[PDB]
Design an enzyme around this catalytic site. Structure first.
Site, mmCIF file in Angstrom:
data_model
loop_
_atom_site.group_PDB
_atom_site.id
_atom_site.type_symbol
_atom_site.label_atom_id
_atom_site.label_comp_id
_atom_site.label_asym_id
_atom_site.label_seq_id
_atom_site.Cartn_x
_atom_site.Cartn_y
_atom_site.Cartn_z
ATOM 1 N N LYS A 12 -13.082 -6.279 6.782
ATOM 2 C CA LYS A 12 -13.834 -5.168 6.205
ATOM 3 C C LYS A 12 -14.809 -5.565 5.098
ATOM 4 O O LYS A 12 -15.740 -4.819 4.794
ATOM 5 C CB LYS A 12 -12.868 -4.103 5.670
ATOM 6 C CG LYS A 12 -12.064 -4.539 4.445
ATOM 7 C CD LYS A 12 -11.000 -3.510 4.063
ATOM 8 C CE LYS A 12 -10.213 -3.973 2.835
ATOM 9 N NZ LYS A 12 -9.048 -3.087 2.517
ATOM 10 N N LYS A 47 0.854 -1.190 0.000
ATOM 11 C CA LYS A 47 0.000 0.000 0.000
ATOM 12 C C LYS A 47 0.893 1.245 0.000
ATOM 13 O O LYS A 47 2.046 1.184 0.430
ATOM 14 C CB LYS A 47 -0.896 0.021 1.248
ATOM 15 C CG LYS A 47 -1.770 -1.217 1.441
ATOM 16 C CD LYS A 47 -2.862 -1.308 0.381
ATOM 17 C CE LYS A 47 -3.637 -2.619 0.510
ATOM 18 N NZ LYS A 47 -4.674 -2.777 -0.550
ATOM 19 N N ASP A 88 -1.167 -5.013 -5.571
ATOM 20 C CA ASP A 88 -2.586 -4.864 -5.300
ATOM 21 C C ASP A 88 -3.247 -5.358 -6.586
ATOM 22 O O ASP A 88 -2.615 -5.347 -7.647
ATOM 23 C CB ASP A 88 -2.952 -3.401 -5.045
ATOM 24 C CG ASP A 88 -3.924 -3.244 -3.891
ATOM 25 O OD1 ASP A 88 -4.901 -4.019 -3.841
ATOM 26 O OD2 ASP A 88 -3.718 -2.354 -3.033
ATOM 27 N N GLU A 89 -4.502 -5.789 -6.512
ATOM 28 C CA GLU A 89 -5.171 -6.297 -7.707
ATOM 29 C C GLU A 89 -5.150 -5.325 -8.884
ATOM 30 O O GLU A 89 -5.079 -5.759 -10.037
ATOM 31 C CB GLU A 89 -6.622 -6.698 -7.405
ATOM 32 C CG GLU A 89 -7.582 -5.545 -7.114
ATOM 33 C CD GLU A 89 -7.333 -4.892 -5.772
ATOM 34 O OE1 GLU A 89 -7.134 -5.627 -4.778
ATOM 35 O OE2 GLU A 89 -7.350 -3.645 -5.708
ATOM 36 N N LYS A 111 2.344 -8.852 -2.092
ATOM 37 C CA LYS A 111 1.712 -8.920 -3.411
ATOM 38 C C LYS A 111 1.353 -7.579 -4.005
ATOM 39 O O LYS A 111 1.211 -6.580 -3.286
ATOM 40 C CB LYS A 111 0.400 -9.729 -3.320
ATOM 41 C CG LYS A 111 -0.668 -9.158 -2.371
ATOM 42 C CD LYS A 111 -1.941 -10.012 -2.336
ATOM 43 C CE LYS A 111 -2.752 -9.963 -3.627
ATOM 44 N NZ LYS A 111 -3.259 -8.626 -3.966
ATOM 45 N N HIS A 152 -6.828 -13.511 -7.670
ATOM 46 C CA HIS A 152 -7.562 -12.463 -6.971
ATOM 47 C C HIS A 152 -8.960 -12.445 -7.581
ATOM 48 O O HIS A 152 -9.107 -12.545 -8.799
ATOM 49 C CB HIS A 152 -6.865 -11.111 -7.156
ATOM 50 C CG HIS A 152 -7.442 -10.017 -6.314
ATOM 51 N ND1 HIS A 152 -8.649 -9.414 -6.598
ATOM 52 C CD2 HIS A 152 -6.995 -9.446 -5.170
ATOM 53 C CE1 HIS A 152 -8.920 -8.517 -5.665
ATOM 54 N NE2 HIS A 152 -7.933 -8.518 -4.788
HETATM 55 O O1 LIG Z 1 -7.319 -4.105 -1.930
HETATM 56 C C1 LIG Z 1 -7.483 -4.614 -0.821
HETATM 57 O O2 LIG Z 1 -8.336 -4.143 -0.073
HETATM 58 C C2 LIG Z 1 -6.621 -5.860 -0.389
HETATM 59 O O3 LIG Z 1 -5.298 -5.736 -0.923
HETATM 60 C C3 LIG Z 1 -6.483 -5.972 1.135
HETATM 61 O O4 LIG Z 1 -5.875 -4.823 1.716
HETATM 62 P P1 LIG Z 1 -5.697 -4.814 3.287
HETATM 63 O O5 LIG Z 1 -4.867 -5.968 3.662
HETATM 64 O O6 LIG Z 1 -4.969 -3.456 3.559
HETATM 65 O O7 LIG Z 1 -7.072 -4.734 3.841
HETATM 66 C C4 LIG Z 1 -7.255 -7.183 -0.941
HETATM 67 O O8 LIG Z 1 -7.253 -7.186 -2.371
HETATM 68 C C5 LIG Z 1 -8.696 -7.574 -0.500
HETATM 69 O O9 LIG Z 1 -8.515 -8.455 0.586
HETATM 70 C C6 LIG Z 1 -9.586 -8.216 -1.597
HETATM 71 O O10 LIG Z 1 -10.838 -8.565 -1.024
HETATM 72 P P2 LIG Z 1 -11.219 -10.109 -0.861
HETATM 73 O O11 LIG Z 1 -10.138 -10.822 -0.172
HETATM 74 O O12 LIG Z 1 -12.556 -10.099 -0.205
HETATM 75 O O13 LIG Z 1 -11.362 -10.593 -2.363
HETATM 76 MG MG LIG Z 2 -6.049 -5.470 -3.075
#
Ligand SMILES: O=C(O)[C@@](O)(COP(=O)(O)O)[C@H](O)[C@H](O)COP(=O)(O)O
Ligand SMILES: [Mg+2]
Ligand SMILES: O=C(O)[C@@](O)(COP(=O)(O)O)[C@H](O)[C@H](O)COP(=O)(O)O
Ligand SMILES: [Mg+2]
Lengths: 140, 467, 468, 140
Positions: free
Chosen positions: B326, B167, B195-196, B193, B286
């Site tokens: 969250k 982040k 981020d998506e 990783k 993801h």
């Molecule tokens: O973009 C985000 O929010 C994250 O990198 C988490 O960040 P944090 O670790 O800072 O919260 C993940 O991609 C989510 O967990 C995806 O949701 P899910 O796992 O429900 O698909």
């Molecule tokens: Mg993410």
């Protein structure tokens, strides 16, 4: 804020971030293995073969992905198939460490249903080792 | 004479509603939560869904006579009432195996959810589950490696794996990305990783990132003595770009890459999964965009189906939700689809949303990834919910630590091992979770610092995706 | 001393992501979200969470923000308007800097804007209603392989809507029977026929066998009628390798057009296919299979207009637009709105048609809308009045359901279309005289008369779910 | 059941499936052109070049996709830019058909905004043509 030291702070996977395991905590892990019907086994290695390395890759083309040397260690005798006695395991830990006092030794357990190791942690580190830190010196 | 061609419209139910049909073990089965328009009988609506997702259209066509509809038609063989709803039903449809292209999730979805969700005759439709028969499962290559093989390649056993999303999401340069990655990994995390949405952008081009991340991976691994990895994102606008990125990862000798299977697509994902199998790369999947489809109870496709589809298309990891984080994720439903993605055989269990007994016929299990708004105090619950075969990721939960990434990673690694140790010793994480963490805080300043910052943080809201 | 520094901990998203005084830049990608907050959650915080988690932020404060400029990269919820008639619904507008997106990647755009925000516990429902794609971002896309004008020029067809037809039954026909049905359909007056969306390659009919027989049918009907003919051969497959092998075969056969299910196949595969079609001269028909899974409900999902813009960007010469009067849902005003967004170069904001932002396509080729699904000869007047000449009207059951067969069924639809087209050109009002135009044509067209008799009382009128 | 004949039943795109257009119906189509401000234009071709063919493809590699000979016809004079008088268009039809009495002749109109032909239909076919059917003989 404390700073996590990058010097002589080598770890050993599962449980290496907790304070050194006591005999009681180790015995508890052994009870866990036996109670679940898993297969205990001991593995060891001399210092130069303790941590993953890339030595062999010198012979490779572009296929090093997920290949590392030193993941395999040497088996102590054989896996304790059919073991239902935690005491037999503690006995072997003693025998193995006594036979190889200067080697790294780890206890593992196998699950033959999923066919994979389901547990593992270090039970002996050579006395000459200076590449690790005690729990209180991991950060400064 | 015999049955002939008669032009004109007639009810779908006359051909597609077969309440006495005995499903064959090779049939693909679908469970649809269907909400018909007023005046439309449930059997006719169910028949329409079966017909328009298999062999029929709105009016009689003479060509049916050239083939055998009895052999190819989809069949609505059961209509179940929904408790607490007097206009919602579960319609079951059986599809002969001949209707599907081998190894193509894309084709399976095109038939089952291609056009029926837009019919005027229905007000809402949601695909709850699919029974994938062993005969069809065998036509897929499946995941590149699977849980057991992944652990064997990483040489990691006895605890859940630890991950972390870098982040801020976007805005970081390639070198700063590698900087944050090294600090994260060296503190105890197994993975970090992209981020998506981090693919290739003006502020950071992908190849620059891959290179600096590689340096960070290898530095952290050498320093800790534990195998490290960072999911490098291969998600791209085209398959050519996707493969170029996968190839670079192969050439750098790194262990794992990731792909957003829904935004990238099943066709692209399957190709990538096959590449990873033939080249030894672990593939993290993801589920970006899944909530657009699986959030509402009345319409869409439940995540369990999206998970089965991914397991078929191929993926070593797949986000599973956290339950306590969250993002939404009801406990029972989550436990249900976690078994569906990890196990070999899962018995029908409606209390967990499992509408059909699922036999995976030895297809590798997919590692569930719990990620999103979780921190150290959640560790007890996470370990209790998922067990060892899962990857718990802490992005903000690591880069949000007051002392930095390394200390943040240390706190999570410590919390994880403390809870793992506790469970193995026979302690009840559900009741003693807090005590386990508080005890570790005594000898772990890193954990204590983390605990103090997020002590009051919880995510508890009304659940939308209810059984 | 001491300027702003790193402070660990959680704080409201709105403190950083709700900026009501932000002036949007002409290069910003804008989004309009129909948002339904959980009780107790301020709309501002809900909108801010959406903007934050679809751009640069996460649930707690991270020190790394300090290494870059959050002001430069953060997504911003700059306006929130209550939805009329809704007590807990709002339209949250979010602006995204162009730097956040990978050039030419619809996959990346969606990953950010609709990636994780739809699953946040803090909200009960969320729907992306529209997106303002700025010219600066539009230009990073190859776009459609050809576009309306080029397609008409390659086919040498002008002055009337094009006519298509999906072969039926959907599945179950052998390759040779497919070609047989195709030939009979095309020779009767239809410009195109097509593989059903789910017809790819299966035990009952492998794809290469179909491609070959269809090629024979295409060329026979073309030689027989003297008009250029085509059949959308499906390239949709399980892997990109298989998809390309199919496109290559179509190229080697010299046929004019192929199709792809862009949502089930995926944007990454679709963009690659569109690029291949541009480089090899193949027309690309796009089927929107699965779209209703996402765009049917008014409270949650993504409206089709956004899915249509995404396809135009990814690439497609044709795109199903719905029929309005057919078996599948498609409200008139909403439909006319995204049809403009699909074909035109510039579309001004118009809420009465669900157009939340003025869209400038900066010369990107227009996409041919395809009206298909449960329509027959009596719907012709309405279809022509709704779409005009630039559209392809498809009659599957409406052709293979004719009592005399495919050729007669094809002729009936071609006659109805030309009759209506002629009537409009003569100044007649199709909305009021449609029925008379059809009845007049029946007097000299026994094919049309037979079709009119069979489907005279068939209509599809239900309550609309996707209301503005 | 009537059978659509495959023999000598050639068509000519837009309006070829309707009964032959009367001079009145043709004039109406012309008014349509002028009312919309489109650019009228006549095109013609000898019988041998009236329908699409593949002859040139003999010189091609694997690139025949959407390439056909005979789509382009010959332009009669020039497009009537600025024409706002339908009589003018009708006079050129007479002049063109008079100059080429045995050729195929079609009337088209261009839109310079979308830059594409927006309408068109046949206005003359050689009297020697025997490859088409009258409205009442398209099916038997
Ligand atoms: O973009 C985000 O929010 C994250 O990198 C988490 O960040 P944090 O670790 O800072 O919260 C993940 O991609 C989510 O967990 C995806 O949701 P899910 O796992 O429900 O698909
Ligand atoms: Mg993410
Ligand atoms: O499968 C079908 O139903 C069709 O072949 C039409 O058949 P008919 O011509 O026999 O109705 C089309 O794919 C739909 O029009 C798709 O829906 P839309 O255009 O809404 O995407
Ligand atoms: Mg179809």
């Amino acid at each position: 804020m404390m700073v996590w030291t990058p010097v002589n702070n080598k770890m050993f996977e599962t449980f290496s971030y907790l304070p050194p395991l006591s005999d009681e905590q180790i015995a508890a892990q052994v009870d866990y293995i036996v109670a679940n019907g898993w297969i205990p086994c001991l593995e060891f290695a001399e210092s130069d073969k303790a941590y993953v390395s890339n030595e062999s890759a010198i012979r490779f083309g572009s296929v090093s992905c997920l290949y590392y040397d030193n993941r395999y260690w040497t088996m102590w005798k054989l896996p304790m198939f059919g073991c239902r006695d935690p005491m037999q395991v503690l006995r072997e830990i003693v025998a193995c460490t006594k036979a190889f006092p200067d080697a790294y030794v780890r206890l593992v357990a196998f699950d033959n249903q999923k066919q994979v190791q389901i547990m593992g942690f270090l039970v002996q580190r050579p006395k000459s080792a200076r590449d690790w830190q005690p729990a209180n010196k991991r950060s400064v | 004479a015999g049955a002939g061609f008669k032009a004109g419209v007639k009810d779908y139910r006359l051909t597609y509603y077969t309440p006495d049909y005995v499903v064959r073990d090779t049939d693909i089965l679908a469970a649809f939560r269907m909400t018909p328009q007023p005046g439309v009988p449930p059997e006719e609506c169910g028949a329409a869904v079966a017909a328009e997702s298999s062999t029929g259209t709105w009016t009689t066509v003479w060509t049916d006579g050239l083939t055998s509809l009895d052999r190819y038609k989809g069949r609505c063989y059961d209509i179940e009432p929904v408790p607490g709803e007097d206009n919602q039903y579960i319609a079951y449809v059986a599809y002969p195996i001949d209707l599907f292209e081998e190894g193509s999730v894309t084709n399976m979805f095109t038939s089952i959810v291609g056009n029926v969700f837009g019919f005027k005759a229905l007000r809402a439709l949601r695909l709850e589950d699919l029974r994938i028969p062993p005969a069809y499962v065998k036509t897929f290559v499946g995941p590149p490696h699977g849980i057991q093989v992944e652990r064997d390649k990483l040489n990691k056993y006895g605890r859940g794996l630890l991950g972390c999303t870098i982040k801020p999401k976007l805005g970081l340069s390639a070198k700063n990305y590698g900087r944050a990655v090294y600090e994260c990994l060296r503190g105890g995390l197994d993975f970090t990783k992209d981020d998506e949405n981090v693919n290739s952008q003006p502020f950071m081009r992908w190849r620059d990132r891959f290179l600096f991340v590689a340096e960070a991976i290898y530095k952290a691994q050498a320093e800790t003595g534990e195998v490290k990895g960072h999911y490098l994102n291969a998600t791209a606008g085209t398959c050519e770009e996707m493969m170029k990125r996968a190839v670079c990862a192969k050439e750098l000798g790194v262990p794992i890459i990731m792909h957003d299977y829904l935004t990238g697509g099943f066709t692209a994902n399957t190709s990538l999964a096959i590449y990873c199998r033939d080249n030894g790369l672990l593939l993290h999947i993801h589920r970006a965009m899944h909530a657009v489809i699986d959030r509402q109870r009345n319409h869409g496709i439940h995540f369990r189906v999206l998970a089965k589809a991914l397991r078929m298309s191929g993926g070593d990891h797949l986000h599973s939700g956290t339950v306590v984080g969250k993002l939404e994720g009801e406990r029972e439903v989550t436990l249900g689809f976690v078994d569906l993605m990890r196990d070999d055989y899962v018995e029908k269990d409606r209390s967990r949303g499992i509408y059909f007994t699922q036999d995976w016929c030895s297809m590798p299990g997919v590692m569930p990834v719990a990620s999103g708004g979780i921190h150290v105090w959640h560790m007890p619950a996470l370990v209790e919910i998922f067990g060892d075969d899962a990857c718990l990721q802490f992005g903000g939960g690591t880069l949000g630590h007051p002392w930095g990434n390394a200390p943040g990673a240390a706190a999570n690694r410590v919390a994880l091992e403390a809870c793992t140790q506790a469970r193995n010793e026979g302690r009840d994480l559900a009741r003693e979770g807090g005590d386990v963490i508080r005890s570790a805080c005594k000898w772990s300043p890193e954990l204590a610092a983390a605990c103090e910052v997020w002590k009051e943080i919880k995510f508890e809201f009304d659940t939308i995706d209810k059984l």
